[PDB]
Write a protein that binds this DNA or RNA. Structure first.
Length: 175
RNA sequence: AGAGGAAGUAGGUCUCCGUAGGUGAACCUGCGGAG
């Protein structure tokens, strides 16, 4: 018998107050969004450390900016990963014109560039300033990560999107 | 002004917060900030 408690940011508290993991994995839950904690407890119907760690990963992935439409995908498919890239990781210049210009390049007006990158490499990303979070299979996470870091190296989004599309097609192909 | 003669050229998304107005709890728009 093991328990795991996770902290949540003060962003998604109403969305966590929305309504089930006891039905999903037979693992008893408690919540308190004023101490920012969510208790996960394993019962006699709870069988595996896989179920424990996957419930923990599902709740933390809902906490870090994804909704349930992209979180029950993590509850369901075991090939699905999350990777959280800080924009402060590997940096091309020392100059502090970073945050606004970089996430203006990555996000794009009305979400055009983030959305086209998502549709191109089949991954699902969310963007909040310094931290950008990628969800999907880890080769798609590698594709989205190399596209985003080539966006912050200062390459144009048209050329980056073209190369991303051709790499995504060659990765979809079997032989 | 005249019929002839002869010639030549052809780039801030999402979420939250503080605002100000709107039709009020909520909610919408605009702005200023943090993730």
């Amino acid at each position: 018998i093991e328990t795991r408690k996770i902290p949540i940011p003060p962003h998604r508290m109403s969305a966590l107050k929305a309504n089930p993991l006891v039905d999903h994995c037979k693992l008893q839950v408690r919540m308190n969004i004023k101490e920012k904690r969510v208790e996960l407890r394993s019962s006699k119907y709870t069988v595996s450390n896989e179920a424990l760690q996957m419930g923990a990963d599902f709740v933390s992935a809902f906490a870090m900016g994804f909704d349930i439409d992209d979180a029950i995908a993590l509850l369901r498919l075991d090939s699905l990963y999350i990777q959280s890239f800080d924009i402060k990781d590997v940096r091309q210049t020392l100059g502090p014109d970073a945050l606004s210009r970089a996430i203006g390049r990555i996000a794009g007006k009305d979400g055009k560039t983030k959305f086209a990158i998502e549709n191109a490499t089949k991954t699902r990303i969310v963007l909040a300033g310094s931290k950008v979070h990628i969800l999907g299979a880890f080769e798609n996470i590698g594709m989205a990560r190399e596209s985003i870091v080539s966006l912050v190296l200062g390459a144009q989004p048209g050329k980056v999107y073209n190369n991303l599309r051709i790499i995504a097609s060659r990765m979809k192909e079997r032989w």
